[PDB]
Every structure is written in structure tokens, then in C-alpha cells.
Coordinates of C-alpha atoms and ligand atoms in Angstrom, one line a residue:
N1 CA 28.2 -8.5 -25.1
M2 CA 28.8 -12.2 -25.6
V3 CA 28.2 -14.4 -22.5
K4 CA 28.3 -18.1 -21.5
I5 CA 25.2 -19.7 -19.9
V6 CA 26.4 -21.8 -17.0
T7 CA 24.5 -24.1 -14.6
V8 CA 25.1 -24.1 -10.8
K9 CA 24.2 -26.9 -8.5
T10 CA 22.4 -25.5 -5.4
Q11 CA 21.2 -26.4 -1.9
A12 CA 17.5 -25.5 -1.4
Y13 CA 16.2 -23.5 1.5
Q14 CA 12.9 -24.1 3.3
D15 CA 11.6 -20.6 4.2
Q16 CA 11.5 -19.0 0.7
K17 CA 7.8 -18.1 0.8
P18 CA 6.9 -15.1 -1.4
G19 CA 3.9 -14.3 0.8
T20 CA 1.4 -11.7 -0.3
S21 CA 4.1 -8.9 -0.3
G22 CA 7.4 -10.4 -1.3
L23 CA 10.1 -12.5 0.2
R24 CA 11.7 -10.4 3.0
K25 CA 14.9 -11.3 4.9
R26 CA 17.7 -9.2 6.3
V27 CA 20.1 -8.1 3.6
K28 CA 22.7 -10.1 5.6
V29 CA 20.7 -13.2 4.8
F30 CA 20.6 -12.4 1.1
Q31 CA 24.3 -11.6 1.2
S32 CA 25.8 -14.4 3.3
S33 CA 23.4 -17.3 2.9
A34 CA 24.8 -19.0 -0.2
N35 CA 22.7 -18.6 -3.5
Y36 CA 19.7 -17.6 -1.4
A37 CA 18.7 -14.9 -3.9
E38 CA 19.9 -16.9 -6.9
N39 CA 17.7 -19.8 -5.7
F40 CA 14.4 -17.8 -5.4
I41 CA 14.9 -15.9 -8.6
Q42 CA 15.3 -19.3 -10.4
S43 CA 12.3 -20.7 -8.6
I44 CA 10.0 -18.0 -10.0
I45 CA 11.5 -17.9 -13.5
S46 CA 10.7 -21.7 -13.4
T47 CA 7.0 -20.8 -13.0
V48 CA 6.7 -19.8 -16.7
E49 CA 6.6 -22.5 -19.3
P50 CA 10.0 -22.5 -21.1
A51 CA 8.1 -22.3 -24.4
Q52 CA 6.9 -18.8 -23.6
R53 CA 10.2 -17.3 -22.2
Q54 CA 11.5 -16.0 -25.5
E55 CA 8.2 -14.1 -26.0
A56 CA 8.3 -13.0 -22.4
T57 CA 9.2 -9.6 -20.8
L58 CA 9.7 -9.0 -17.1
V59 CA 9.8 -5.5 -15.8
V60 CA 12.1 -5.3 -12.7
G61 CA 13.0 -2.4 -10.5
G62 CA 13.0 -1.4 -6.9
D63 CA 12.8 1.2 -4.2
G64 CA 16.6 1.9 -3.9
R65 CA 17.4 -0.3 -0.9
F66 CA 20.9 -1.2 -0.2
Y67 CA 21.7 -4.4 -2.2
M68 CA 19.1 -3.7 -5.0
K69 CA 21.5 -3.1 -7.9
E70 CA 23.4 -6.3 -7.2
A71 CA 20.1 -8.2 -7.2
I72 CA 18.8 -6.7 -10.4
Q73 CA 22.2 -7.7 -11.9
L74 CA 21.3 -11.1 -10.6
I75 CA 17.8 -11.3 -12.0
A76 CA 19.3 -10.4 -15.3
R77 CA 21.9 -13.3 -15.3
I78 CA 19.2 -15.9 -14.5
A79 CA 16.6 -14.3 -16.8
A80 CA 19.1 -14.6 -19.7
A81 CA 20.3 -18.1 -19.1
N82 CA 16.8 -19.4 -18.7
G83 CA 15.5 -18.1 -22.0
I84 CA 13.5 -15.1 -20.9
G85 CA 13.5 -12.8 -23.9
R86 CA 13.5 -9.3 -22.4
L87 CA 13.9 -7.4 -19.2
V88 CA 12.9 -3.8 -19.0
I89 CA 14.6 -2.2 -15.9
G90 CA 14.3 1.1 -14.3
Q91 CA 17.2 3.4 -14.8
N92 CA 19.5 2.8 -11.9
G93 CA 17.2 0.0 -11.1
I94 CA 14.7 2.6 -9.9
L95 CA 11.0 1.7 -10.3
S96 CA 8.3 2.6 -7.8
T97 CA 5.7 -0.2 -7.2
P98 CA 2.9 1.9 -8.9
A99 CA 5.3 2.3 -11.9
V100 CA 6.0 -1.4 -12.2
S101 CA 2.3 -2.1 -12.2
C102 CA 1.9 0.6 -14.9
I103 CA 4.6 -0.7 -17.2
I104 CA 3.4 -4.3 -16.9
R105 CA -0.1 -3.4 -18.1
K106 CA 1.2 -1.0 -20.7
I107 CA 3.7 -3.3 -22.4
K108 CA 1.5 -6.4 -21.7
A109 CA 4.4 -8.1 -19.9
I110 CA 4.0 -11.4 -18.2
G111 CA 4.9 -9.7 -14.9
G112 CA 7.5 -8.2 -12.7
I113 CA 10.1 -8.7 -10.0
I114 CA 9.9 -5.7 -7.6
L115 CA 12.9 -5.3 -5.3
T116 CA 11.2 -3.7 -2.4
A117 CA 10.7 -4.4 1.3
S118 CA 8.2 -1.5 1.4
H119 CA 8.3 0.2 4.9
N120 CA 11.0 -2.1 6.3
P121 CA 14.3 -0.3 6.6
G122 CA 17.1 -0.7 4.0
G123 CA 20.8 -0.7 4.5
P124 CA 23.7 -3.2 5.1
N125 CA 22.1 -3.8 8.5
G126 CA 18.5 -3.5 7.1
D127 CA 16.0 -5.7 5.4
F128 CA 15.6 -6.6 1.7
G129 CA 12.7 -8.0 -0.3
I130 CA 11.8 -9.6 -3.6
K131 CA 8.2 -9.4 -4.7
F132 CA 6.6 -11.0 -7.8
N133 CA 3.8 -9.4 -9.8
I134 CA 2.0 -11.1 -12.6
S135 CA 0.5 -10.2 -16.0
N136 CA -2.3 -8.0 -14.7
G137 CA 0.3 -5.8 -12.9
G138 CA -0.9 -6.8 -9.5
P139 CA 0.5 -9.1 -6.8
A140 CA 1.2 -12.7 -7.5
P141 CA -1.8 -14.6 -6.0
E142 CA -1.8 -17.6 -3.8
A143 CA -1.7 -20.3 -6.5
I144 CA 1.4 -18.8 -8.1
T145 CA 3.1 -18.1 -4.8
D146 CA 2.4 -21.7 -3.7
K147 CA 4.0 -23.2 -6.9
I148 CA 7.0 -20.9 -6.4
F149 CA 7.5 -21.9 -2.8
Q150 CA 7.1 -25.5 -3.7
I151 CA 9.9 -25.1 -6.2
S152 CA 12.2 -23.2 -3.8
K153 CA 12.2 -26.2 -1.5
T154 CA 13.4 -28.6 -4.2
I155 CA 15.7 -26.3 -6.2
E156 CA 19.1 -28.1 -6.6
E157 CA 20.3 -26.2 -9.7
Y158 CA 19.7 -22.9 -11.4
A159 CA 20.8 -21.6 -14.8
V160 CA 22.8 -18.4 -14.9
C161 CA 25.2 -16.2 -17.0
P162 CA 27.9 -15.6 -14.5
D163 CA 29.7 -12.9 -16.5
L164 CA 26.7 -10.9 -17.8
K165 CA 26.7 -7.2 -16.7
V166 CA 23.9 -4.8 -17.3
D167 CA 24.5 -1.0 -17.2
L168 CA 21.5 0.3 -15.4
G169 CA 22.5 3.9 -15.5
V170 CA 22.3 4.4 -19.3
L171 CA 19.0 4.4 -21.2
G172 CA 18.1 2.3 -24.2
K173 CA 18.6 -1.3 -25.3
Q174 CA 21.3 -3.7 -24.3
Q175 CA 21.6 -6.8 -26.3
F176 CA 23.2 -9.9 -24.9
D177 CA 24.3 -12.8 -27.1
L178 CA 24.2 -16.1 -25.3
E179 CA 26.8 -18.4 -26.7
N180 CA 25.1 -21.5 -28.1
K181 CA 21.7 -19.7 -28.1
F182 CA 20.2 -18.3 -31.3
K183 CA 17.8 -15.6 -30.0
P184 CA 19.6 -12.9 -28.0
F185 CA 18.8 -11.6 -24.5
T186 CA 17.6 -8.0 -24.7
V187 CA 17.5 -5.6 -21.7
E188 CA 15.7 -2.3 -22.1
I189 CA 16.7 0.4 -19.6
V190 CA 13.9 2.9 -19.2
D191 CA 13.4 6.2 -17.5
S192 CA 12.1 5.6 -14.0
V193 CA 9.3 8.1 -14.2
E194 CA 8.1 8.4 -17.8
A195 CA 5.6 5.6 -18.3
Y196 CA 4.1 6.4 -14.9
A197 CA 4.0 10.2 -15.6
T198 CA 2.5 9.5 -19.0
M199 CA -0.3 7.6 -17.2
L200 CA -0.9 10.3 -14.6
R201 CA -0.9 12.9 -17.2
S202 CA -3.8 11.0 -18.9
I203 CA -5.9 10.7 -15.8
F204 CA -5.4 14.1 -14.2
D205 CA -5.6 17.6 -15.7
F206 CA -1.9 18.6 -15.5
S207 CA -2.9 21.9 -17.1
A208 CA -5.1 22.7 -14.0
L209 CA -2.6 21.2 -11.6
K210 CA 0.0 23.4 -13.2
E211 CA -2.1 26.6 -12.8
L212 CA -2.8 25.8 -9.1
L213 CA 0.8 24.9 -8.3
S214 CA 2.6 27.8 -10.1
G215 CA 2.7 31.6 -9.9
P216 CA 2.6 34.0 -6.9
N217 CA -0.9 32.7 -5.9
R218 CA 0.1 29.1 -5.9
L219 CA -0.8 26.9 -3.0
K220 CA 2.3 25.9 -1.2
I221 CA 3.0 22.1 -1.0
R222 CA 5.6 20.0 0.7
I223 CA 6.0 16.4 -0.5
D224 CA 8.2 14.2 1.6
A225 CA 9.4 11.0 -0.2
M226 CA 11.0 9.7 3.0
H227 CA 14.2 9.2 1.0
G228 CA 12.5 6.5 -1.0
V229 CA 11.6 5.7 -4.6
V230 CA 8.9 8.4 -5.2
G231 CA 11.6 11.1 -4.9
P232 CA 12.3 11.3 -8.7
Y233 CA 8.6 11.1 -9.5
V234 CA 7.9 14.1 -7.2
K235 CA 10.7 16.2 -8.7
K236 CA 10.1 15.2 -12.3
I237 CA 6.3 15.4 -12.3
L238 CA 5.4 17.7 -9.4
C239 CA 8.2 20.1 -9.8
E240 CA 9.5 20.0 -13.4
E241 CA 6.2 19.4 -15.2
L242 CA 3.5 21.0 -13.2
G243 CA 5.9 23.7 -12.0
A244 CA 5.9 23.4 -8.3
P245 CA 8.9 25.2 -6.8
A246 CA 11.9 23.0 -6.1
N247 CA 11.6 23.1 -2.3
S248 CA 8.3 21.3 -2.4
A249 CA 10.3 18.1 -3.0
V250 CA 11.3 17.1 0.5
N251 CA 13.8 14.1 0.9
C252 CA 13.3 13.2 -2.8
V253 CA 16.7 11.6 -3.5
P254 CA 16.5 7.9 -3.0
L255 CA 19.1 6.6 -0.5
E256 CA 20.3 3.0 0.0
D257 CA 19.4 3.3 3.7
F258 CA 16.5 5.7 3.2
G259 CA 18.4 8.2 5.3
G260 CA 18.8 6.1 8.5
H261 CA 15.2 5.7 9.5
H262 CA 12.6 3.5 7.9
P263 CA 10.3 4.6 5.0
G264 CA 7.1 4.0 7.0
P265 CA 4.4 6.8 6.9
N266 CA 2.6 8.1 10.0
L267 CA 2.4 11.2 12.1
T268 CA 5.3 9.9 14.3
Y269 CA 7.6 8.6 11.5
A270 CA 7.1 11.4 9.0
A271 CA 7.5 14.0 11.7
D272 CA 10.1 15.4 9.2
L273 CA 7.1 16.6 7.1
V274 CA 5.1 17.3 10.2
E275 CA 7.5 19.8 11.6
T276 CA 7.5 21.6 8.3
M277 CA 3.7 21.5 8.1
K278 CA 3.4 22.9 11.7
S279 CA 4.8 26.1 10.3
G280 CA 1.4 27.0 8.8
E281 CA 3.3 28.2 5.7
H282 CA 2.1 25.4 3.5
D283 CA -1.4 24.4 2.5
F284 CA -0.7 20.8 1.9
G285 CA 1.8 18.2 2.9
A286 CA 2.1 14.6 1.8
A287 CA 4.4 11.7 2.6
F288 CA 5.0 8.4 0.9
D289 CA 6.4 5.0 2.0
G290 CA 9.4 3.3 0.5
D291 CA 8.0 1.8 -2.7
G292 CA 5.3 4.4 -3.3
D293 CA 2.1 2.5 -2.7
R294 CA 1.0 4.4 0.5
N295 CA 0.5 8.1 1.4
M296 CA -0.2 10.4 4.3
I297 CA -2.1 13.7 3.5
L298 CA -1.7 16.8 5.6
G299 CA -3.4 20.2 5.8
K300 CA -2.4 23.7 6.8
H301 CA -0.7 23.8 10.2
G302 CA -0.4 20.0 10.1
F303 CA -4.1 19.3 10.0
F304 CA -4.1 15.5 9.6
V305 CA -6.4 13.7 7.2
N306 CA -6.6 10.2 8.4
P307 CA -6.5 7.7 5.6
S308 CA -10.1 6.4 6.0
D309 CA -11.3 10.0 5.9
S310 CA -9.1 10.6 2.8
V311 CA -10.6 7.9 0.7
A312 CA -14.0 9.4 1.6
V313 CA -13.2 13.0 0.6
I314 CA -11.8 11.7 -2.7
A315 CA -15.0 9.7 -3.2
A316 CA -17.0 12.8 -2.3
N317 CA -15.3 15.0 -5.0
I318 CA -14.4 12.2 -7.3
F319 CA -15.5 14.0 -10.5
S320 CA -12.8 16.6 -9.9
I321 CA -10.6 14.0 -11.6
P322 CA -11.0 13.7 -15.4
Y323 CA -10.3 9.9 -15.2
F324 CA -13.6 9.4 -13.3
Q325 CA -15.6 11.7 -15.4
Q326 CA -14.9 9.4 -18.3
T327 CA -14.9 6.0 -16.5
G328 CA -17.8 6.8 -14.1
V329 CA -17.8 5.3 -10.6
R330 CA -17.9 1.5 -10.9
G331 CA -17.8 1.2 -7.1
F332 CA -16.1 1.9 -3.8
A333 CA -14.2 -0.6 -1.6
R334 CA -12.3 -0.5 1.7
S335 CA -10.8 -3.0 4.1
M336 CA -13.2 -4.1 6.8
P337 CA -11.3 -2.4 9.7
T338 CA -11.3 0.9 7.8
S339 CA -13.7 3.5 9.1
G340 CA -17.1 3.8 7.5
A341 CA -16.6 7.4 6.3
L342 CA -16.5 6.1 2.7
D343 CA -19.8 4.2 3.4
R344 CA -21.5 7.4 4.2
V345 CA -20.5 8.8 0.7
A346 CA -21.3 5.6 -1.2
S347 CA -24.7 5.6 0.6
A348 CA -25.5 9.2 -0.3
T349 CA -24.4 8.6 -3.9
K350 CA -26.0 5.1 -4.2
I351 CA -22.7 3.4 -5.2
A352 CA -21.7 -0.1 -4.2
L353 CA -19.5 -0.4 -1.2
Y354 CA -17.5 -3.6 -0.8
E355 CA -16.1 -4.3 2.7
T356 CA -13.0 -6.4 2.0
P357 CA -10.8 -8.4 4.3
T358 CA -7.3 -6.8 4.5
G359 CA -5.2 -7.7 1.5
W360 CA -5.0 -6.7 -2.1
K361 CA -6.5 -9.6 -4.0
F362 CA -10.1 -8.6 -3.0
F363 CA -9.6 -5.1 -4.4
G364 CA -7.9 -6.5 -7.5
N365 CA -10.6 -9.0 -8.2
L366 CA -13.3 -6.3 -8.0
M367 CA -11.3 -4.1 -10.4
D368 CA -10.8 -6.9 -12.9
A369 CA -14.6 -7.3 -12.8
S370 CA -15.2 -3.6 -13.6
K371 CA -16.9 -2.9 -10.3
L372 CA -14.3 -0.9 -8.4
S373 CA -13.1 2.6 -9.1
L374 CA -11.7 3.8 -5.7
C375 CA -10.4 1.7 -2.8
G376 CA -9.2 2.8 0.6
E377 CA -7.3 1.3 3.5
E378 CA -6.9 2.6 7.0
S379 CA -3.2 1.9 6.8
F380 CA -2.3 4.9 4.5
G381 CA -3.5 2.9 1.4
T382 CA -5.5 4.6 -1.4
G383 CA -5.8 3.4 -4.9
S384 CA -7.9 3.2 -8.0
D385 CA -8.4 0.8 -10.9
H386 CA -5.9 2.7 -13.0
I387 CA -3.5 -0.1 -11.9
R388 CA -3.4 -3.2 -9.7
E389 CA -1.4 -1.8 -6.8
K390 CA -2.1 1.0 -4.5
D391 CA -0.6 4.3 -5.5
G392 CA 0.7 7.1 -3.2
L393 CA 1.6 9.9 -5.6
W394 CA -1.7 9.3 -7.3
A395 CA -3.6 10.0 -4.1
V396 CA -1.7 13.4 -3.9
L397 CA -2.7 14.4 -7.4
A398 CA -6.3 13.5 -6.6
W399 CA -6.2 15.7 -3.6
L400 CA -4.6 18.5 -5.6
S401 CA -7.3 18.3 -8.3
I402 CA -9.9 18.4 -5.5
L403 CA -8.2 21.4 -3.9
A404 CA -8.2 23.1 -7.3
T405 CA -11.9 22.4 -8.0
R406 CA -13.0 23.2 -4.4
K407 CA -10.8 26.3 -3.7
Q408 CA -10.8 25.7 0.1
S409 CA -8.1 24.6 2.5
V410 CA -7.6 20.9 3.3
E411 CA -9.2 21.5 6.7
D412 CA -12.3 23.4 5.5
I413 CA -13.0 20.5 3.1
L414 CA -12.8 18.0 6.0
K415 CA -15.1 20.2 8.1
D416 CA -17.6 20.5 5.3
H417 CA -17.4 16.8 4.6
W418 CA -18.0 16.0 8.3
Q419 CA -20.8 18.5 8.6
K420 CA -22.4 17.1 5.5
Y421 CA -21.8 13.4 6.1
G422 CA -21.2 13.2 9.9
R423 CA -17.8 12.3 11.2
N424 CA -16.2 8.8 11.6
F425 CA -13.8 9.5 14.4
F426 CA -11.2 6.8 14.0
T427 CA -8.1 5.4 15.7
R428 CA -6.3 2.0 15.8
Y429 CA -4.5 0.6 18.8
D430 CA -1.4 -1.5 18.1
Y431 CA -0.4 -3.9 20.8
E432 CA 3.0 -5.1 19.6
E433 CA 4.7 -8.3 20.7
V434 CA 2.1 -9.5 23.1
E435 CA 2.3 -13.0 24.3
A436 CA 0.6 -15.3 21.9
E437 CA -1.4 -17.6 24.2
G438 CA -2.8 -14.6 26.0
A439 CA -3.6 -12.9 22.7
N440 CA -5.2 -16.0 21.2
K441 CA -7.2 -16.6 24.4
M442 CA -8.5 -13.0 24.4
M443 CA -9.9 -13.4 20.9
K444 CA -11.2 -16.8 21.7
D445 CA -13.2 -15.6 24.7
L446 CA -14.4 -12.5 23.1
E447 CA -15.5 -14.5 20.1
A448 CA -17.4 -17.0 22.3
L449 CA -19.0 -14.1 24.2
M450 CA -20.1 -12.4 21.0
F451 CA -21.7 -15.6 19.8
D452 CA -24.1 -16.0 22.8
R453 CA -27.6 -15.1 21.6
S454 CA -28.0 -12.4 24.3
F455 CA -25.1 -10.3 23.0
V456 CA -27.0 -8.4 20.2
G457 CA -29.1 -5.9 22.2
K458 CA -26.7 -5.8 25.2
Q459 CA -26.2 -2.2 26.0
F460 CA -23.2 -0.3 27.3
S461 CA -23.3 3.1 29.0
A462 CA -20.6 5.8 28.9
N463 CA -20.1 9.3 30.2
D464 CA -23.1 10.3 28.1
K465 CA -24.4 7.8 25.6
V466 CA -25.5 4.2 25.3
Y467 CA -24.2 2.1 22.5
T468 CA -26.2 -1.0 21.5
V469 CA -24.7 -4.0 19.8
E470 CA -26.5 -4.4 16.4
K471 CA -24.3 -7.4 15.3
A472 CA -21.2 -9.2 16.4
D473 CA -19.3 -11.9 14.5
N474 CA -15.9 -13.0 13.2
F475 CA -15.7 -11.4 9.8
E476 CA -16.1 -13.8 6.9
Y477 CA -16.0 -12.7 3.3
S478 CA -17.1 -14.6 0.2
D479 CA -15.1 -13.3 -2.8
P480 CA -17.6 -12.4 -5.6
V481 CA -15.0 -13.3 -8.3
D482 CA -12.6 -16.2 -7.5
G483 CA -15.1 -17.8 -5.2
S484 CA -12.7 -18.0 -2.2
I485 CA -14.0 -17.8 1.4
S486 CA -11.8 -15.9 3.7
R487 CA -12.8 -16.4 7.4
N488 CA -11.6 -15.4 10.9
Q489 CA -10.7 -12.0 9.5
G490 CA -11.7 -10.0 12.6
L491 CA -14.1 -9.7 15.5
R492 CA -16.7 -7.0 14.8
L493 CA -18.9 -5.3 17.3
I494 CA -21.4 -3.3 15.2
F495 CA -23.3 -0.7 17.2
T496 CA -26.7 0.7 16.2
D497 CA -25.5 4.3 16.0
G498 CA -23.0 3.4 13.3
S499 CA -20.0 2.8 15.5
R500 CA -17.8 -0.3 15.5
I501 CA -15.0 -1.9 17.4
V502 CA -12.9 -4.5 15.6
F503 CA -10.1 -6.7 17.0
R504 CA -7.5 -8.4 14.8
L505 CA -4.3 -10.4 15.3
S506 CA -1.5 -9.6 12.8
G507 CA 0.4 -12.3 11.0
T508 CA 3.7 -10.5 10.1
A509 CA 7.8 -12.3 16.2
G510 CA 5.2 -12.8 18.9
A511 CA 1.6 -11.6 18.4
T512 CA 0.4 -8.1 17.7
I513 CA -3.1 -6.9 18.5
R514 CA -4.8 -4.3 16.4
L515 CA -7.8 -2.6 17.9
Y516 CA -9.8 -0.4 15.5
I517 CA -12.3 2.0 17.0
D518 CA -14.8 3.7 14.6
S519 CA -17.0 6.2 16.6
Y520 CA -19.6 7.9 14.3
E521 CA -21.2 11.2 15.3
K522 CA -23.6 13.3 13.3
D523 CA -24.1 16.2 15.8
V524 CA -22.2 19.4 15.0
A525 CA -21.6 19.8 18.7
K526 CA -19.5 16.6 18.6
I527 CA -18.2 17.0 15.1
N528 CA -15.0 18.9 15.7
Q529 CA -14.2 17.9 19.3
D530 CA -10.9 16.2 20.0
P531 CA -10.9 12.7 18.5
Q532 CA -9.2 10.8 21.4
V533 CA -11.8 12.2 23.8
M534 CA -14.9 11.1 21.7
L535 CA -13.2 7.8 21.0
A536 CA -12.7 7.2 24.8
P537 CA -16.2 5.6 25.5
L538 CA -15.8 3.0 22.8
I539 CA -12.2 2.5 23.9
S540 CA -13.2 1.8 27.4
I541 CA -16.0 -0.4 26.1
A542 CA -13.5 -2.3 23.9
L543 CA -11.0 -3.0 26.6
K544 CA -13.5 -4.1 29.2
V545 CA -15.4 -6.5 26.9
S546 CA -12.1 -8.0 25.7
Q547 CA -10.4 -8.0 29.1
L548 CA -7.4 -7.2 27.0
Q549 CA -5.3 -6.0 30.0
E550 CA -6.2 -9.2 31.9
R551 CA -5.1 -11.3 28.9
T552 CA -2.0 -9.3 27.9
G553 CA -1.0 -7.4 30.9
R554 CA -1.0 -4.2 28.9
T555 CA -2.2 -0.9 30.1
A556 CA -1.4 1.0 26.9
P557 CA -1.0 0.1 23.3
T558 CA 2.4 0.3 21.8
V559 CA 1.2 2.8 19.1
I560 CA -1.9 5.0 18.6
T561 CA -2.8 6.3 15.1
Ligands
LIG1 CA1 4.6 0.0 0.3

């Protein structure tokens, strides 16, 4: 109840970058490395002028990783002794990343510390992360993350309350009286799900989702939370409030280790859900990543809706969703390597399509400027301007509202969408841990070759067709808001039939090659053929023009999705 504020002299580290997605180290780093977490928490609290701390609220929560509660305890001690007026924390420390974004904008907080390492595994031998979100509810941008890192290199003391202890399991206010401070420190413990449910309730028709999900004629759904943070949201919204039967909530109790495996969503990693969905007993499966920003969408028998098709089908039936009826469509966005299925829909409906470089800030900027309603990422990311993060459970409810409106299966919707818009066959090849100089040279040469003036027009034949290069560059994007220029974001081979090949090198232990292949077909004799077969021509073309085997020694990507 009554705590001393004490100051501790510290030794600064040199690698405490927040990055675009939070500071991530092994839990063992955050556990053994002395004051490692205490340092970085101080560094960021030092980003806000001391004059505004009493008036300031941070929301903090996390995805349930091992070491989370201890770290929220830690945020509290530094928050108090530095003059921050209020923390509002998820019950048990539980806050999905969409929920944090929601609460920040709802209570007009100055921002939030999210304890999440997203897909990376949690556990005593796992990873742990600390992300900072600012007052618009979205990720701390570069200028704030630079100041913070600059501070973490110099940090030689932090202010703390060594004996403060928050009870995260009980709801309501906790008031902490700092001895030799006048204004108290107040923590508000809130229900993990309520503010976020209250938001979803406002954008969807829960009445209609309740009709479709209940009764003897309900569609059967299985929602796999991968033992992460969305578990309680599924059970409390999907099962308790719109009345889905209890067994729909698969792996919906958060575990400190996420159940052994890592909370990353794909057809290999959520095979849990996939085996269930192969039954053909359920009409719709979904699976979420660890902090709830990503989603995979499944159909009857495990029909797979690839994320770039997903964002397109949502765009195609967007007014099924009350939120968009009232807002209208301010525009569509998708990362550059995402398939152009969404483009086909934005082109039919004459709505702006922004092709963004991978990363959130480009989506966020467009939302802040009221020109972006629905954004999509090939990497299981789907979001809307209801917040400033991507939102997994939200994508599921959009799909459910569309199923309700449309009264077809997931698969018949995709077939009609393809038949009506043509299909963007799509895959991405991951080459993990390739040798860097080879990787870098491969891009270097393929860039040089693309820049020669004879390259546009160069034809390539395959077992049937000829693709012709319409354009070929390293992707550069001029942000229409903050004015930034982002360059060297990916080699694009644009073919005249609407197909593309794009190469990228990842940034987050060696070098990893991503090769995205977007083969577009409009003929209903090609439309429902096997995707890896129709993608093979462009895959052969891609590998030959990059000489990727010759530069990496690989015959096969690590991972195909
Ligand atoms: Ca995530």
C-alpha cells in the first residue's frame, strides 16, 4: 500500500533496440543479464516528459509468455517511481495486441507496453519480448524507437519501487502511496476481453452472428488459439456471447510455453486445427498467433484460404459488416509481396489500392489520413482502421458475417470469387539461413539484369504460355503522409498477364530468401487446378533468372506456403 521509491545505479547495454516489433531476447537473457529488463523499461519511460507523467496512463499486458507476470510487476515498479500516474493492466497480465490497441485509443492513453514476442516460442527456454505502442494505439515509430535506443546505451540509473506488488488477478483499482510523493500511483486491473469485445460488438452484428452460430442448424466452427492470448477472447466472445458450443474453442487456455510448440500460424504449424478440419465435420476453422494480430482461415475439409485471397474476399463482401456500411470504404491496402487478388476487387469497385512495403507504419499512416479501411498481408495479416494493429479474431468475425450474408460454404465463396475475379494463385518460397554473400550477390545480379533496357519485353516460354516482362525494378515507396522514402524493398518482375515474381531478403542469423510467386489466371479451365502445378512455370522462371541454386546451393526452399 505504502512504498519507497529507490534509485539503482545500472550498467547500460548496447543491443536494446525496440525494432519495429519489440525488443526480443531469450527469456534467459532477460532473467540472468542484470537489470536488462529494468534498463529498457526505464529507457522508454524516460521518453515522456516528466511533466506529463502524472497525467499519463500506460496500458500494459501480454500474451501469456513465461516471465510475463514478473515483467509486468517490473513495469509497475518503474512506472510508479518515475511519476507515471496510472497503469491499466490486463487481468493476469492478459492483453492481446489488438486489445492493447483498443484500450489505448478508448481511454486516450499515451501508449502501451505489450509483453509479447508474437510467434516466437515462450517458456524458460523460450524467447520474450517487450514492445512499445504510442498514443494512437499503433507501433512506436522510428523516431521514438531511436530516442529509446539512444537512451538504453547511456542508462546508468533507473528509478524503481523495489517493494511494490500489484495483484494482477483481482479486478478494480489498486492505489499505491509513494512515500515522499503527493499524488498516488494508481493501477487499474481490467478484464482482458471486455473493452475489446465491446468494440467488436459495435462493428459486427452479434445478433446475426449469434443466430448463425447457435441452434441445431448452426454452422460448426473450430477456433484454435494455439495456446496463446486469444483463447479467452474466443471463449468469452465466440462461445459465451454469440453462443457457439464450447468445443469450438480449441487450445483456448493461455499457457506460459504455448503448449510446447510455437504460436506461429500456418498449415504446417496449426496442423492441430488442420487435422480437426480434415474431418469435414466443421464448416470453418481459424487459427491465431501468440498475441492475436494474425489469422489463418479454413474451410470445410480443410479448404485453405490463403491470406492474400482472404483480404480479397473480405473486400468483395465488405458491406456484410455493419462497420463498413457506416464508414464506407476509404481504401484498400496490402504489402507489395501480397498477391494481387485484392487489386482485382479494388479495380472492379473503383477503390484506391495502396501497395505498401512490408511493415505496419505505411498502413497506419494511411488509416490516420482516413484513406484506408481494409489492409492485407500475405503473412496471415488482416486488419482494418478500427485500430492501429492487425487483428486476428476480427478477421474471423468478418468471415462469419460474410458466411451469414452469403449462405455458402467457405469453398464455394472462394470458387465464385475466383470465377468472378479470376484467381491469383500464390505461394512464397522461404530459403532460410542461406549464406549472405551468395544471397546478396544473387539479388545484386538480378537487380543489374533487371535494369538493362532490354529486359522489359524479354519473353519466357513454359509448358504452355509465354510471360512477358512489363516492368522490373527494386521496389521504392514514397509515403504519402510522413514523406519518407523506403527503397530497396524488393525486386519485382511484373508480367503483362498480371503475374509477378518478387524476391526479398529478410532482416530478422544468416540471410533468408523469400520468393513470392503470384500467377494470375482468368480461364475457368485453369481456375481450380492444383496451385503448385500452375505456379510451376513462374517458379522455374524465377529460379532460372535469379540463378538462385547457383548462388545459394539450394535445390529446395526450406518452407513452402
Ligand atoms: Ca503477432
